[PDB]
Structure formats: structure tokens, C-alpha cells
Symmetry: D2
Subunit: 371 residues, 4 copies
């Protein structure tokens, strides 16, 4: 095999999460790329050094080091300096060093099994004839693979127009070729639901009961960046979208991985690749913040997502690899920004897609500069 894996995490904490995260990473010999920020205290740097004494291939480049790498690649203004968007630095660094597997995690996720890194290496098994899951409505609820109380829930980013009729959707499994390049692992405790669902029923994930699935062509499901492995080929299409763009005056937030999860998914299907959902499952403790503020942050993106997802199914792309496909995707978003109709599509909402498309090319242009 001889597979290299790099875990990418951005944080502003003191580094205490490394105590319950390092053992699973250092046992598999995987590299951990911790991306600090301006508002990151010197305790995280000391915590990374201490865990490197204990035998962890951890790196924590200071904001000075990060700005130099982005400066050489002619992208000094691409990544903001007070946001979790800085995880793109860890994406770029792991892609530069040439890792096979890039695992994107948050600083509050804990692996629940010993084979955490091994289960994420499924994106490097290549194309096999394997059971792939299809849905008559083109959507798959990966939260249905879990035991959730008090009621059924959809993951964050799942389109709202498809939820009422999804209970009638036919689900079939067929033995077909598939090349898994993205593996989204599930989460116990507080699942990855949007702020709307969390305020309504406060879901609780008890256990992973549904196993693992591989979605077929035409069946989609939102992919996150808190427990997801991405093959280095698919990483150019995994650019964490920059937030802050106002929709009808209200800036969107906390949806960078919803767009990247769909974008790397659309790009993978154009190249005949698939997305996997299931194991490894992480421990995600419950929240502790302002859920009404989370709602006010997520609504601007939620108002647009259903329209953007519908137009992406009708926009065929081009490209031989992920860089060419992701750029063809950026041009598709600019055409979508002028065709889509709706009350939430004020001039600033349409301009959100146009600036995002430019930032997506600035990301790929920096990757071509590396190569």
C-alpha cells in the first residue's frame, strides 16, 4: 500500500483537543497540519510541540509562515485572516507535500475507533465493482444511517424542496463500478444538522446503525469538512468557499463546506468518481453557543442553496482532471447567477456567485503554480 495521510485542522483554542486526538493519528503515522490564526494564543504552539515530543507528526505554521507561502503562489488576499477559511492553508500544504489522503476535521471531533485513519484510506482503493446506492429523487439522507433521537433529521445542506417527498423515494443498490475519492464519515452525539433543525428538535446521534454506502451517479448528499477524507486528485475541487457575502444585506456564514462538499461532489461525478458515506465515525459533543445567532448566519446561504443545486444538475461541465473541472464549474456558477430567479436573488446574491467563481480560479491558479 504505502499510503500517506494528512489530517487538516484549523483552530483558535489552547490545544487541549490534541490530548484525545493525537493517539489515533500518531499510531497510524499520519501527519497533522494544525492551522492557527491571528487570534490564536501561544498555548496551541506549545501543545503541538509537546505532542511532537510524544511522537506525533504535527505541524503548526504561524500566520507569518502561512502568508509567505501564499505570497510566493501569488495569492496573498485569497484566504481571510479571521475565519475558519484558513483550513485551505492545510489543504494546500498537504497537497504540496504530496499526501495521498487529506482528512479535514474540526478541532472538536474525536475518533471513536482505532482504525480511524485506515477507514479514511478508502479513497485510495481505486475503482472497483461495488454496491452503489441510488435514489429515485437524486438525494440520499446520510443521517438515516444513524440512530437519532427524538425524530428523523436531514444533514446540514440538504435541500429543503426535496425533504417532504424523500420519504416516498425509492432506494436501490446495484453492483456497478465506482472510484471512491471522497469519504464522509459520520458523527455521534451532536450530528451535522443545520441551525434550523438544531433549534427545533435538538437531535442526538446515538449510534451508527446503517453501515456505509457509496452514492451512484445522479444521487447527491451534502458533504462536510469536519470528518471527510479527500484523495489528492479531488482536493483541487475541495476549496473551502469564502463566507461573508451578503444576501439581501445579510452576510452568509458557516456554509463554506456545504458548497465545497457539493462542488467536489459534482466534479467527482463528472470524472466518474463517487462519494462514500459511513465510517469512520467521530465523537461530536453538543453545542454551547448562540443557536439563534447560528440561524441568523446560515439563513442567507440556505435561501440560495436549493436554487443553486437545481441549476447544477442541468449544467454539464468539462475537464480532464479536477483542476479543469473545478474551473469549468466556476464558469457554470457565473451563468447560473444570471439565469436563476427568486425573491432572495437580489443583486448582492447574484454577485456572491461571481466573486466566489473568481476565488475558485485563484485557488486553482495557485495549485497550478505549485505543480
Amino acid at each position: 500500500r504505502d499510503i500517506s495521510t494528512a489530517v487538516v485542522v484549523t483552530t483558535i483554542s489552547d490545544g487541549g483537543f490534541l490530548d484525545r486526538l493525537a493517539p489515533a493519528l500518531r499510531d497510524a503515522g499520519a501527519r497533522l497540519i494544525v492551522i492557527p490564526d491571528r487570534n490564536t494564543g501561544p498555548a496551541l504552539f506549545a501543545a503541538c510541540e509537546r505532542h511532537r515530543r510524544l511522537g506525533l507528526d504535527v505541524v503548526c505554521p504561524s500566520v507569518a509562515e502561512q502568508q509567505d507561502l501564499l505570497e510566493r503562489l501569488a495569492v496573498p488576499d485569497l484566504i481571510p485572516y479571521h475565519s475558519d477559511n484558513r483550513r485551505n492553508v492545510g489543504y494546500l500544504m498537504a497537497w504540496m507535500e504530496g499526501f495521498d489522503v487529506i482528512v479535514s476535521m474540526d478541532d472538536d471531533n474525536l475518533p471513536t475507533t482505532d482504525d480511524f485513519v485506515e477507514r479514511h484510506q478508502v479513497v485510495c482503493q481505486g475503482p472497483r465493482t461495488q454496491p452503489v446506492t441510488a435514489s429515485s429523487d437524486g438525494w440520499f439522507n446520510n443521517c438515516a444511517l444513524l440512530e437519532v433521537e427524538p425524530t428523523e433529521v436531514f444533514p446540514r445542506g440538504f435541500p429543503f424542496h426535496a425533504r417532504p417527498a424523500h420519504a416516498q423515494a425509492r432506494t436501490s443498490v446495484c453492483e456497478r463500478p465506482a472510484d471512491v475519492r471522497i469519504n464522509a464519515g459520520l458523527w455521534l452525539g451532536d450530528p451535522d444538522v443545520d441551525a434550523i433543525t438544531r433549534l427545533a428538535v435538538r437531535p442526538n446521534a446515538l449510534a451508527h446503525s446503517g453501515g456505509s454506502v457509496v452514492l451512484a451517479e445522479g444521487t447527491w448528499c451534502p458533504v462536510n469538512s469536519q470528518n471527510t477524507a479527500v484523495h489528492r486528485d479531488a482536493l483541487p475541487a475541495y476549496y473551502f468557499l469564502r463566507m461573508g457575502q451578503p444576501v439581501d444585506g445579510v452576510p452568509m456564514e458557516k456554509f463554506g463546506d456545504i458548497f465545497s462538499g457539493y462542488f467536489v461532489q459534482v466534479c467527482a461525478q463528472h470524472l466518474g468518481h463517487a462519494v462514500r458515506f459511513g465510517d469512520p465515525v467521530v465523537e461530536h459533543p453538543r453545542n454551547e453557543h448562540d443557536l439563534l445567532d447560528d440561524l441568523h448566519k446560515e439563513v442567507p446561504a440556505v435561501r440560495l442553496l436549493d436554487d443553486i443545486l437545481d441549476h447544477l444538475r442541468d449544467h454539464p461541465l468539462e475537464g480532464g482532471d479536477y483542476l479543469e473541472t473545478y474551473e469549468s464549474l466556476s464558469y457554470a456558477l457565473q451563468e447560473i447567477a444570471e439565469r436563476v430567479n427568486g425573491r432572495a436573488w437580489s443583486p448582492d446574491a447574484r454577485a456572491f456567485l461571481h466573486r466566489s467563481a473568481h476565488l475558485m480560479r485563484s485557488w486553482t491558479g495557485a495549485l497550478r503554480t505549485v505543480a
Copy 2:
């Protein structure tokens, strides 16, 4: 002891709902006050004039008659002309003509029992020793009196900060004196939940199983205007609050009755009166909205309600009747607009309470003009 009842409904439809609503109203000799708007087609007037042929005590004052009435009360600018706020015209007319019971309804509710008016006449039974319900957390979930699928839900306007711990709250019933002047009837089909709950679980209320309760002092529950009887004494405090005020730039909507229900509730309790929940139950069919637009409209008011409800418990009021208590409440809101802190309390959100307090005094000023 002949009790007179007036039903207030504002609508822009052609008047087809009168075909099914008038039977239960004319069987009790009750008055129906339909309040049309500017865009209300001339077909509603034909339905009202024709349903009066069948014995319905219905009125439908055109916008010319509504504005001539509001001119003489020195309040021409109080009520907007493209909003459901125009139901205040119906409240004013019934209180002018001297009805004992004012039943507020929407144009899509349907009485499910033949005793609809009689069950709403409970707000005239006077004070007597009756079983009253109290709660350790000071909140009562009226939806718990219903059979709701797929999971438990809270009514629209229920404070979000008290929802997680409400399951542990103790509920007791004690024989205590109480005077019911507000009776909020429940609703089958699509229950009155906020847009957050409806997007999440799409609730369906199957039956009324919990019976009727009378809330005690210090126990609150949101009261809407879709199926609520208000005694003529309590009506001055039942002013339907005017929407449209921006909160951090986003205008609020669909919460006029949420503020009115709490305001008439706090005023009733200060005067020794109580609110009742339960019967009569109406049929509110599930109407397919733009639920994302409903969410975008309700979030501005939701961001402030939790703070507003907490301060209204700390602020004692003054007044002998509802007219004096409602004015003291308006001065209390202006004191709250400067006391309160939070991220959602930008200068426009604070000025929303100040403009609302002035409009409430304008509403009571017109009632003092009539009386």
C-alpha cells in the same frame, strides 16, 4: 345573560371560506366583521352580501369606510393598507358596537364542532374558583394538548431559551380563583408553529387530547389571533402589533399576534385575569407556503423575543383597567429598549420597541376617543 359575540377576519380572497364558516356563526346569531384590503377583489363583497341573505350577521366595510372611521378617531396613519394588521379595524368596530366576545380568526380556519361560539363564550363566565395550571419554569406548551406527528413541537412565539429544560419542568393543577378573559382555541392539521419548526419536521396535529387548561399567575404561553376569543374589557390590550421594523437591517413580519398575545396576557395577569387554552378546536389545513421566505420573515422578531420576554417579567406595571395597563406596558417597552443587551440589538432593533410603544398609545388613544 344574553352574550353577544363578534368574529373578526381580514382577507384578500374572493370569499369562498364564508361557505363553510357561516353555518356555525349564523346558527349562534354571531356577528362577522370581514375586513377587506386594497387589493381585495370585489368578489368578497358579493359573498358577504349573499351570505347575509342566508341569515349571517356579516359586515364588510370597504377601505373608504375604514379610512373614514379611522379619520374621525384621529388615527389615519395607524393601520397600514397592505398587511394583515387591518384586523385591528375589526377589533375597533366590534368594541365600538359593544360586543361581549371578540373572536379573532384567519380566513382559513374552520370550526370543527357545532358549539364553536359557545365554547368561546367562556371568557364571560366571570371569576370563580377553578382548576388552574402552573409550571415550575413559567411556561406551558399548548401543543402538548394535541396529538402531533412526527414529534413534539412548541407553538409559534414560544421562547427558545426555555425549550431544552422544559421537559424537566413540573406541572401542577390547583383549585384557585381565576377570571378567564382570553381563550385561545387550538388547531388541527397544520399547528401554529414558527417557520423553524415547520421546516424541520412539518408537524401534523391529528387530534385534541389534553383537554383545556387555565394558566396561573407567572405561567405564560404565546397566544395567536387565528382562533382566540377576547373579552371586551381585555381587547384594548389586544392591539395587533405593526410589522415591518428592521432588526439589524432585516424587516420582521408574521409576528403581530405573537406580540399582541403576550401583551394582552401580561396585562390580564396584572389585573388578576387569566388565559385559557384548549377548545374550541378549528380545522387549519396545511397550506403550502414559501417556507424559506416565512423563515426569513420571522427570524428578525425571534432574535428579540427571548430578551423581551425576560425583561417583561422583571418590569411591574400599573393600571386599573386594560387601557391604563396597556399604556403602562408601552412605557415599559421603552425602558426595556435601552436596558436590553445582545448581538441582535442594533439601533434599529431598539427603535422598533420605541415606535411600537407609540403606536400602542395611538391605538389606546383612539379607544379613549370612542368611549
Copy 3:
């Protein structure tokens, strides 16, 4: 007939302006009340303590002393803590300690004559038959009393709708009884023009040539707080209005004294008092601002002032002194907030008058507490 004068200045600088300002103040034995802010460096306190060694009756209450004072007056939230609105603290202290004349100045004005305090004591001369100036259009351009290059200009706050026809307006002087309680001194160098005029022609006031005038009843002119003496009776109506309220989404700024100057002007005229323009003239050097930012700040208030001034002429007031007249003015503003029409009168702009009216009552409520 010993008259006491207090100069009120708020600043965030290091206190270098005291080197040139204190001579004219300590030569007249006048009191200087410097009001620092949170971000005011500790160098200002050394300049005040040291200028008192040279005989200056100066005080500089820290933010701790300012908040302790405002706590006992039940107005802790009245005055923000990062605004020039904190000069209201200086108005409060001088009115508390009982000074006859309160001279409002900025930290960049410089008296050009040795009789600065004496010329400002004109607001204590009492009522006498004196030449008063009237205008056929009801407006007087105080900048016409100055020599301004390169062209004629209007002061900041002058209504725009009356500017084109003001050249045809007739000006007459008549021996009439008048009682001056407000004296607005003029300014050489950079005149007090709005950001619109300054961006256009960059005015430069070379000399004071028109002398002094006393405006008659029905003749108005904006009064600022950069060089204005207010008698202690008129000070309750001189509350520096709080900025920040959004007009159609855009927050207003730099117009607190424009509203205060008109408010104390309308209140003085209802009580039979007059406003004076002319001497003493200060040296206001041209300070290079971000003039585009100044324009963006002043436009919100400018969009409303023309409508507000027109309605304030139609609304008669009540009151025996300034405390009762200023409160009647606040109730008049709430009546105007609903009467007025225009494109710039979105719900947030109307609620700006309602919140301002409450803050004015809070200001007078604290003065009633002191007295």
C-alpha cells in the same frame, strides 16, 4: 452681576489644544469641563492637571466618575461611550454646579480675540428692545456674515429646499423686544458647512464682515456646538442628539448638534427668546478628513431634515420653561414620525424620531432629578 461661564469640550487627543485655549479661559476665570472618552489616552489628564497649576479652572472627570454620576441620575444607558455625544456630560455638570453661561466648543477651535468669554456672556443681557433680523423665507444664512472663498456657502444643517430661492428673500431689521439666550459664534478658516459643500468648493472663511444679528420669530438658522453659548435656562433643550440610527439602512452621524441647535431654537422661540449669530469668532483650521466618509455619514440625516423642519413649523408646542417645552417637542417629533411622507422615510427612519423622543425625555428626566 458677576456672571459665571463654563466651557464644555469633549476630546480624545493628548490635550495639546489646552496650550492655546487656556489663556483666554483662565483670564476670565471661566470653568473648563473636559470630557474624556474610553479611548482617551492618559496624557490629557496630565495636561489638565498641569494647566490648573497655571490657574485654569479645568476639570476632567474620568469615565468612572462620569458613569457614577449618570448612575445616580437613573440614566446609565443614555450616553454612548465611543461618540462625541459625551459632551452631554459636560452640559450636565455645568448645569448641576449652576453656571450662568455654558459655551459648547470642540477641541480644535481657537478664540481669535481676548474678549471671547465676554462676548459669549451676551446670553445673560436679559430682554431689551434691540434690532432684530427677519427674513421673508424664514431662514438666515450666517455664513453670509463671513468672507468666504471661492463662492457663497450655507452652514451645515441649512435646509436644501430653501437654498435656491433664498437669494430672492427679503431681509429687514426692526427695533423689537428680544431675549438672547443662545449665541452661536462664527468660525474662520474652514467654515461649518456640510460635507456636500466642502467636497464641492472647499470653502475658506477669510474674515468676519457682516457683524452680529439677532433672529426674529419665524426666522431660523442652524446652530452648532463648536462655538455656541447657551444660557442655563435654555440648556435643558440643548441635548446633543444621539447618532447611529439607520435611515433606509444607512446609519447617520455628525448631526447631533444640528438637531440640538434647531431644538433649542424652536424651544427658545416658543418661550419668547431669540438666537444670536456673529461674535466671538474662533479659529477652526482646515483639518484633512476622509470627506467621502463624512458625506456617507451625513446623507442619512440630511435626507430627513428638510421634512422635519417643515413639520416643526406647523406643530405648536406647550410649556412654561425649557424642560416642559423640550418634552412637548419630543411628543411633537413622534407625531411627525407618522405624519411625514417621502422616499427616505422607511420604518427605520420613522423609528429614529421615536427613539430620539424617548432619549430626550430621559435627558430631561435626569435634569428634573438633579433640580
Copy 4:
């Protein structure tokens, strides 16, 4: 010679302006392309037909005809349907029919001389060695060529950072080769000043006294679309920019020709071509609308223009003709949107350049489809 000229005007009026505009156009045999809108009454169509009886080569394509041409060229959503941006239709139509000179005028401009069309044919004289005007600050005040009362003024779109020092700027004329492709004619009566200047001094253009100038390389001046001739080669770079994009929440307006005037100017200088200012001069009567509303509309663009103009001088372009240069300009604006710094450069302001750049390519892509 054998020169064809097409005058482009968009309007919503009844067509009365054709009475005083047709004689100068029909005498020279020039085509007039009147572009109506949705809110255009049938009187303009009758007025165009009547003037065609009198011998005017006028055309007035209905909104149905306009949408078909844009539909064939795969640009159905490029041009909005309630704006003067529809003059781009007249630009495209005259470019399709192959006119040498395209004269862009407003419906309220009247030629003051008989040689109006002949003086605008100067953009077809080709390159000659002629006196070109240079300025040490790189800016030229074309309003200095007029007699303006009561004081000197700058044209709309002139950068504000350069105005104070422009009085010291050296002006020299040198005999050098120049190919005039854009000729901006001046205007008597109400000049083309921004809303800031018009509210301050209300300028009045008395006569054209300065003659005509041809700006050299590096010397710029804003160009408008109300009295300007554009050679068909330079027309691809004359796309009237679409307004409505919010800057810090405030949408910009009335600045479509300010950006197009600078863009066709920058593109012309890259190709060695020049811009001419002077004759022919038109009659522009005084305004009649809400000048405060004009200010509120123009400020969002004014806050950005000085920054955009500075970066355009430091961004070298590419291209052999105007189509290639205008597209290279669109990519330059996207790089400028991420390099520029300022308080007014909120996320929606930066996204204004990105969407504008996409619309500029959609314009050129439609022109390449025509060819």
C-alpha cells in the same frame, strides 16, 4: 467621405423631444435609434412614425423586438428591463447595421448648432499629427472649457482626491500623433456635474469658451453618454455598465456612463487612440426632480471610483482590438476587487466589480456572435 452616423437615445417620454431634435438629425441623413422600455407609452411610437413621415431615419424597436435580438445572441438576461441601461440595445443595433459613428444622447439634449452631426464625425478622421493636451496630474477638467456660474466646477465622475491640487497642475499642448475615436461634446445650461456639486452651487453653463481639446496619453477625463460620439471600433468598449449593485447595503445608480466613459477611454489609450472634448455643444435644461435622491443614488459609486481609477493606472492591459482589450480590462477589474483597500470595500462592493466583469464579457461575447 461617405460616413454613416447613428444617434442612440433611450426614453420613457411621449416623444415630444423629437420636435426639437429631428431637424438636426434628418438634415445630415443620420439614423436615430430610439430605445423604448416596458413603461413606455404608445405616444412615442406614434411620434417616431410621424417624424419618419417628415423624413427622419428613425427606428423604435418594441421591447418584444429587443428581446428577440438579445435572445438570438444568447444574452437574454444581460440588459435589465426598467432602466436606461437599455441604450445598450441601440449600441448593439447600430454596431450590427455597421455605422461609422454612434452618437449617444439623452432624450433631453438639444443640438445648438447646425453642424451637430458633422462635428461628431471627428472620430472618423483617422490618425493625424495634432495638438494634444497633457496635464501634470493626469487629469483634465473639461468643464474649464465652459463659462460656468457662480463658480468653477468639475464634471461628474471626476475623482475627488485630485480636485484640490488640480489648480496647480501644469497644462501643456504638444503637436503629436493622435487617433480620435471618442468625442465628448459639452453642454450648455445645466452641465454634467455630480449630485454633490449640483446641490452645493447649482452650476449654470453660459457658453462654450475654451474650444476643443484632445487629451494625450496619461491624461484622463470622465466621459458621459448624453452627448458623445464613438467610432464603431471603440464601441465594444462602450458597454453601459449595469447599476443596482449595493455598496455597503446601498445600491449605486446613475453611474453607468461614468464607468463606460472611463473604460472606453482606458481601452482607447492602450490602442494608441485618444479622446476629444469640446464641440458640438448641446442644450441641457435645468433639473426638476429630487436632488437629495440623486445624491443618495450616486454616493455608493462615488465612494469606489477614486480607488478604481487609481488601480487602473497601474494595471497594464492586453489586446489587439477593442474586444480583446475590453475583456482584458474585465479580468483587471477582478484583480482590482481583491487588491483594493478601504472602508467602503465591503464584500458586496468587491463583488460589484466581479459581476460587472462577467457582464462585460457577456456584452463582448454577444458582439463576437454578431461578427
